[PDB]
Amino acid sequence: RKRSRKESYSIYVYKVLKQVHPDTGISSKAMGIMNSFVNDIFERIAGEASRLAHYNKRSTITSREIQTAVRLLLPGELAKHAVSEGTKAVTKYTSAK
Amino acid sequence: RHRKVLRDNIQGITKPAIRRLARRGGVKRISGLIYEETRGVLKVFLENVIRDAVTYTEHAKRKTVTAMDVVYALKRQGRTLYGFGG
Amino acid sequence: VKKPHRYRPGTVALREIRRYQKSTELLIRKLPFQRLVREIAQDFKTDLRFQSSAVMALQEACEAYLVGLFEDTNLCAIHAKRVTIMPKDIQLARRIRGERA
Amino acid sequence: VGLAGPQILPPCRSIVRTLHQHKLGRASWPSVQQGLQQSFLHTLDSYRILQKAAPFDRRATSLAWHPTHPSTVAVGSKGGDIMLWNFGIKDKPTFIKGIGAGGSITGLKFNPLNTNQFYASSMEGTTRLQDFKGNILRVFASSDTINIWFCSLDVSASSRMVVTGDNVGNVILLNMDGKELWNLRMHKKKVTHVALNPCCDWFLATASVDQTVKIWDLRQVRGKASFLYSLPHRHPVNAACFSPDGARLLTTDQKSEIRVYSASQWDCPLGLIPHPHRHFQHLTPIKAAWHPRYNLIVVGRYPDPNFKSCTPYELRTIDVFDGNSGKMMCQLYDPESSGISSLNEFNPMGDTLASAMGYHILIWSQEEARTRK
DNA sequence: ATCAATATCCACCTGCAGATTCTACCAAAAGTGTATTTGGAAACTGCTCAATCAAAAGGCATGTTCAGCTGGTTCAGCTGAACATGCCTTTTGATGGAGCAGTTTCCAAATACACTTTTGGTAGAATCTGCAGGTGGATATTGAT
DNA sequence: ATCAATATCCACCTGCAGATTCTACCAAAAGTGTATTTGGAAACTGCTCCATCAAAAGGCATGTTCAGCTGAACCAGCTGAACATGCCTTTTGATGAGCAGTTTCCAAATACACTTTTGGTAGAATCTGCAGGTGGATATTGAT
Asked: How many Å apart are CA C63 and CA D304, to the nearest integer?
């Protein structure tokens, strides 16, 4: 009866997939790939933010730091669009409390 | 009798398999001396990675090498691997 | 028909290129690779065991690495107005990446 | 190690004269038994010519010798299929089938009384007594619930007792007509082998996966591990078999070891015979055996690249060691039989050896005699 | 071999930009004690690993061909290192004089933390359907007379 | 150039291996409220940075000249692809312990508050190795 609990990002990837291509499915291996990919990007960004924080003797990670790290790690137009989405997200979240 | 299959070692990584691998890279024509050198190269790569993996294994007081150890050992060499967790 | 039908040198290699590039299955057999890993691991630490997926992951990593190496090798070869890769090409590529040994 | 091999010679000193020395009364019997042990080893290096072969279906699990007659033997399969076979008869020996899948016979001794009978222990969960014609005479005990079955079995006639082991940790002890006063638990896990001493009647041995082997007193103990002795191990145990004389207990593990325990202070061992008989799932577990009239040991070798071999040549072969010394004296080998000799058993008679390999049964008697007119 | 022209390296000197040493002192280290958390030795258990034998599927070691690739030879350009000359962008070195890096205050914003109450993410039992595989037929790419 | 060979694409058919949908339930996420930081505005200062001038000055722009280099035809030979074969490796299915993975629990390990030193560091006061200078002995180079 003993049973563990392993979390993932699967269900959310499935949601996004159904949003962009309703008549399409995805296999377990690829979902695992996407899971590992998400984990990798998460680790890179958080580590980079940490390094920026530590270099400026600031003890708080904010949206600003994330934005900076994004501009550092990713190239060009991808950065700009993603940054747009992030800013839009913050503007929506901060208003409709 | 002397088989020890061809060396009981890397030489089981047979020639036509290396040929197929070179075919994946778009290559058309291969020299006869390539094979052995490639094998040596392969060994070195494996050696380094396996060493690191075994080291991770040694830290947890296990006798079973898990996939995670291979992933991390590959990540430190700048050859991160996706699709096996992490 | 009298004589066996015979393709010219190079064509079948190209056919192999397209066929293997279109697919994704692993080209090396499991068992020899298992034995190789087991031998090398035995020389560092004794009576180790290996999960199957770890062996699979090593297989994927090795094949991807070799594919990349042959790619750079082929470019170096083309640079010298040849079509035949040779050991010194591989040595050149690995020396440039810094994968010294 | 050494002293015999593919290249090295068996025979030590040429002391045969001692027989007449015994006729004079000077030299003692044990020295003579030593010399004739030597003789048997010498002629055993000419057992090399494999006499006979015999197949049947899926897998071998147990072996047993007809006590009175030399050339007759019984064997038990993975699928409850029993065979009885006699040599020099040519009457196409006798067979009996079972379910074939989950009915693995795991123990088999002949009937000391009615030679056409036999006891058996079965994966079905029924320690039975049954005839070579097929008729089941009597069940003796029962699981009464599947997925819990027996593994070990042995009997004694001088005391008229039967003993059997389970897959969880408990041992049962019956009379030859039922009348069960037992089924107290002895161990924590499966009981791989178990046996009774022949020269006394009333101390017992059992071995288990618990890394422990235990010596009991079946009339005196009743208190659920109010046992007599308990010997520990580093690994599990595949078999614990007594001597015929009763003073030397032999034990054989699953990883890499053989141990000789003595009458004198069961706890400590006399000697360790390191030798690989590594355990594995589909393989039949290996069972050392005594030779009834000497101080020899006979074992099947299953090489291991990780076992620290003293000898540089490691083949798939049958090894023969000395009991009260520690080192080896002979090695039987024959290609066309590169399988792994799971089981090996000598006759009570002394002129024959049987081997049970995967899907194969082998007979190793000598041959190539001279002729009559 | 043998002889002139510059380039490199040894020997000997000398004063100063950088190195080393000597103060004062103040932000870390150590001690002590007490509060908090944790890693590792026992009890279990359910997935997974270790490797044999028999029967069959698929691939590889070998040995026979022969097309075209390598690689050495020779040769017609060509173009890129040496080196002269004259002028000019840079070094150095100084001075001013604005602006920013970095400190110090401080307080209104922000967030960690201790609970309490909802809730959706995930193991596991019932459906399902796209694709692996298989059958069959039509076009494409090689290559010879 | 046109005909056979063979490889490969493409239409059509079927059942099953993952794909997909439906329960319980519990670790996880939101809400109150409070304790506790903490990062940005304001006020100052002195370090460092930026626009100018001037006197060389070593270095850069340009123009010759020719000795070595880069390719381009050509060909011997070699060496490695195509293919056939038999054979040998590899695959795949038969229904035991070992170890990854939990759960307890407490003896050891270590965070946190405060005081007592004390070693590290900025800046003043000496040292000195080595960057410049000078002079002469070979060491390369290159023509003859």
From this structure: 31
Quickly give D271 CA vs E46 C1' distance in Å: 38
Task: Decide: CB of C87 under 7 A of nucleic strand E.
Answer: no
φ/ψ of D25, rounded to 5, equals 95, -5
Distances (CA, A) of C22 to A31, A33, A41, C13, C15: 22, 20, 29, 14, 11
In Å, the largest CA–CA distance within chain D is 69
C-alpha to C-alpha distance for D184 and D169, rounded to whole angstroms: 9
How many domains does chain D fold into? Answer: 2
Closest CA to D299 of D248, D235, D351, D238: D238
| D341 backbone dihedrals φ, ψ, rounded to 5° | -75, 95
Q: Which residue of D has its CA nearest to C41?
A: D306
Rounded Cα distance between D48 and B4, Å, is 25
Closest-CA residue of chain B to C41 = B50
* Residue D170, CA distances (Å) to A33, D167, D349 in order: 49, 8, 34
Host domain of residue C25: 1-101
Domain span at residue D260 reads: 51-373
Q: C-alpha angle with apex A66: A65 to A70, nearest 5 degrees?
A: 115
Amino acid whose CA is nearest the C1' of E47: C51
Contact D55, D364 (CB under 8 A): no
Question: Is C47 close to D306, i.e. CB distance below 8 A?
Answer: yes
Residue length of chain C = 101
With an 8 Å Cβ cutoff, are C40 and B43 in contact? yes
Spatial contact of D213 and D231, defined as CB atoms under 8 Å apart: yes
Q: Assess whether D44 and D95 both reside in one domain.
A: no
Q: Give the CATH number of domain A3-97.
A: 1.10.20.10
Residue D3, in any domain of the structure: no
Sign of the CA dihedral D240, D272, D232, D149? negative
Number of domains in chain C: 1
Decide: helix, strand or coil at residue D81: coil
Resolution (A): 4.3
Residue pairs between chains C and D whose CB atoms are closer than 8 Å: 4
Where is D113: in which H helix or E strand? none
Which residues fall within 8 angstroms of residue D132, CB to CB, at 6 or more apart? D82, D84, D94, D96, D116, D117, D118
What is the 3-state composition of chain B as percent helix, strand, coil, each rounded to the nearest 5?
55, 5, 40
CATH code of C30's domain = 1.10.20.10
Within a domain: residue D339?
Answer: yes
Q: How was this structure determined?
A: cryo-EM
Is C46's Cβ below 8 Å from some Cβ in D?
Answer: yes
CATH number, residue D145? 2.130.10.10
Residue A37 sits at the chain B interface (C-beta within 8 Å): yes
- The domains of chain B, with CATH numbers, are 7-86 (1.10.20.10)
Chain B hits for A28, CB-CB cut-off 8 Å, are: none
* Amino acid identity, position D64: A
Same domain, D40 and D61: no
Between chain B and chain C, how many beta carbons pairs sit less than 8 Å apart?
151
**What are the two backbone dihedrals, phi and then psi, of residue B79, each rounded to the nearest 5 degrees?**
-130, 50
Tokens of D302: 């299953």
Residues D326 and D189 in one domain: yes
Cβ of C46 and D305 within 8 Å?
no
Domain ranges of chain A: 3-97
Give CA–CA dist D117/D127, Å, rounded.
14
